[PDB]
Amino acid sequence: WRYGGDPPWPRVSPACAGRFQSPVDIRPQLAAFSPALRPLELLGFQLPPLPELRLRNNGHSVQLTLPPGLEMALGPGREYRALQLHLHWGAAGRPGSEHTVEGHRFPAEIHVVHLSTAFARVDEALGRPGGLAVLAAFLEEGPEENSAYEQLLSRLEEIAEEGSETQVPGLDISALLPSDFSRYFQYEGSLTTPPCAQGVIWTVFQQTVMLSAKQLHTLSDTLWGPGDSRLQLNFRATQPLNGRVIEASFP
Amino acid sequence: WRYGGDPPWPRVSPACAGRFQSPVDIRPQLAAFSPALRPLELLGFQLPPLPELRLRNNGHSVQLTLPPGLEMALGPGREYRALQLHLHWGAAGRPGSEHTVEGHRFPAEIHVVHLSTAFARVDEALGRPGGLAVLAAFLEEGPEENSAYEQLLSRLEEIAEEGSETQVPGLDISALLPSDFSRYFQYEGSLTTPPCAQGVIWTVFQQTVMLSAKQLHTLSDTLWGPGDSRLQLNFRATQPLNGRVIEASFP
Numbered sequence: 278w279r280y281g282g283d284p285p286w287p288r289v290s291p292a293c294a295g296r297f298q299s300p301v302d303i304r305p306q307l308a309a310f311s312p313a314l315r316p317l318e319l320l321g322f323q324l325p326p327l328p329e330l331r332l333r334n335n336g337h338s339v340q341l342t343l344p345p346g347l348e349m350a351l352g353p354g355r356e357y358r359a360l361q362l363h364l365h366w367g368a369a370g371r372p373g374s375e376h377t378v379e380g381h382r383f384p385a386e387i388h389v390v391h392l393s394t395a396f397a398r399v400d401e402a403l404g405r406p407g408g409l410a411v412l413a414a415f416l417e418e419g420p421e422e423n424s425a426y427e428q429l430l431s432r433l434e435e436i437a438e439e440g441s442e443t444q445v446p447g448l449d450i451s452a453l454l455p456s457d458f459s460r461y462f463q464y465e466g467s468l469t470t471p472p473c474a475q476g477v478i479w480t481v482f483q484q485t486v487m488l489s490a491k492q493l494h495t496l497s498d499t500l501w502g503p504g505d506s507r508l509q510l511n512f513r514a515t516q517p518l519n520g521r522v523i524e525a526s527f528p
Numbered sequence: 529w530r531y532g533g534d535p536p537w538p539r540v541s542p543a544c545a546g547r548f549q550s551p552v553d554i555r556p557q558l559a560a561f562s563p564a565l566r567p568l569e570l571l572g573f574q575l576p577p578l579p580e581l582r583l584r585n586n587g588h589s590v591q592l593t594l595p596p597g598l599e600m601a602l603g604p605g606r607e608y609r610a611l612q613l614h615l616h617w618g619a620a621g622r623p624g625s626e627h628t629v630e631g632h633r634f635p636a637e638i639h640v641v642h643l644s645t646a647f648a649r650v651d652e653a654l655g656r657p658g659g660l661a662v663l664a665a666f667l668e669e670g671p672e673e674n675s676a677y678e679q680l681l682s683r684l685e686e687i688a689e690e691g692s693e694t695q696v697p698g699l700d701i702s703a704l705l706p707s708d709f710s711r712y713f714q715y716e717g718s719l720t721t722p723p724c725a726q727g728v729i730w731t732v733f734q735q736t737v738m739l740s741a742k743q744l745h746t747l748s749d750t751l752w753g754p755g756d757s758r759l760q761l762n763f764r765a766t767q768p769l770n771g772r773v774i775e776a777s778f779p
């Protein structure tokens with residue numbers, strides 16, 4: 278499968294034609310305040326430099342494979358383990374976040390994909406309720422260089438080639454996310470890539486993460502994709518809520 | 529395992545010492561109002577008189593096998609098929625509901641047990657989040673004979689003996705349930721019988737169903753359990769929430 282160009286995605290996976298797909302346009306006015314939604318809890322995210330992690334240009338994103346041991350709770354009894362993180366970005370003067378807020382697209386978005394601790398394998402969790410959970414944060418232009426992000430953005434040149442990978446030192450994975458783990462939107466949707474399986478819990482942080490203009494440019498301008506062509510605008514079109522209600526952890 | 533003795537239930541099934549067990553004490557003023565909680569949808573529950581349904585004294589409860597085609601939705605895309613229903617009750621002048629409200633135990637309780645349609649088999653769904661969903665209603669004493677419950681209660685005498693069973697005409701299963709499908713409590717817990725699997729979504733109707741005194745006496749007084757003892761007080765003690773917030777569909 279390619280971005281914005283054949284193949285139909287439903288030719289690749291019927292699930293890409295489901296009624297309850299991601300990403301979505303978040304309208305904070307229409308979100309349901311749900312006080313049951315407690316602050317997210319992360320254990321094991323502060324990684325030592327060794328062992329190193331695989332950072333890959335899979336020709337769709339830059340993917341960082343996460344080691345065993347990264348535990349994430351959405352709340353009492355809702356336990357997950359981190360598998361990987363990847364990013365969605367645009368191009369020079371074109372934003373590329375997947376989620377939008379009242380129609381506004383942010384420059385980029387980080388996703389940390391997690392597997393429910395009721396499942397041994399991703400293939401058993403796909404399409405099952407709460408089988409996968411994604412933590413998503415918007416990236417916005419800031420005045421300072423983000424030094425958490427610099428550790429990965431500095432390695433992109435090594436993996437410019439489509440299908441290329443490198444080993445990078447472990448780092449504080451939680452430092453790539455906002456500091457506010459209490460304020461977020463939550464909804465049930467899908468993977469935004471084939472196979473677009475449903476039953477995914479999306480948590481979208483209200484607080485954004487700041488990258489320098491230079492970092493956003495390194496993200497959007499270094500990697501190559503399928504087809505002597507730049508890896509850019511790697512986001513799926515907004516999908517209708519189709520009657521789903523987005524919950525907010527805050528009034 | 530019998531009810532009200534040994535073997536301690538952990539010594540039958542370590543799962544019963546899980547951290548997120550059922551039933552629980554509902555305290556409506558600590559419940560979180562969650563406007564995302566939509567009215568329950570129950571299609572296919574109005575059964576014709578044939579085929580007949582298996583009704584069973586299994587020594588723990590009376591259990592009605594439900595046919596295929598009873599479809600239930602907790603939310604958009606979040607669908608279930610009914611498997612069976614059974615009851616929990618007390619004895620002469622003693623209540624036997626499983627769930628309590630502010631400490632109050634009701635005369636009896638009906639459980640309608642469903643399988644998520646993301647799972648082909650019950651055994652795949654046990655322990656998976658949202659794999660099983662139970663609809664629970666409290667049975668309270670009313671002036672009138674409940675004609676929906678009379679179809680089952682009139683048949684208890686035929687199956688009075690542990691392990692005996694009978695065939696009963698199709699009935700409207702939805703007629704055993706309260707009037708307002710928009711008003712309920714919901715939390716995630718467990719089976720209240722071994723193997724005490726967690727990941728069960730419990731939906732407890734705010735409104736109660738009314739049975740006559742005669743009918744409740746028939747329920748608690750007709751059936752024989754393990755050994756030569758009466759099948760009575762077939763409810764599990766209430767369990768700690770351990771941080772779980774009970775949600776409410778109504779303010």
Ligand SMILES: COC(=O)c1cc(S(N)(=O)=O)c(SC2CCCCC2)cc1Cl
Nearest residue numbers: 337338388390399411468469470472511
């Ligand atoms: C540009 O989009 C992506 O490259 C991408 C985006 C996602 S997402 N946005 O989280 O759905 C996943 S997640 C999924 C892929 C299939 C197997 C489990 C992990 C994997 C990937 Cl590879």
Ligand SMILES: COC(=O)c1cc(S(N)(=O)=O)c(SC2CCCCC2)cc1Cl
Nearest residue numbers: 588589614639641650662719720721762
């Ligand atoms: C007195 O309790 C019961 O008789 C009972 C109570 C339940 S409950 N309250 O729904 O957990 C189930 S459900 C379950 C048991 C075996 C696995 C699938 C269905 C089955 C039964 Cl048989």
Ligand SMILES: [Zn+2]
Nearest residue numbers: 363365388469
């Ligand atoms: Zn993604």
Ligand SMILES: [Zn+2]
Nearest residue numbers: 614616639720
């Ligand atoms: Zn039960």
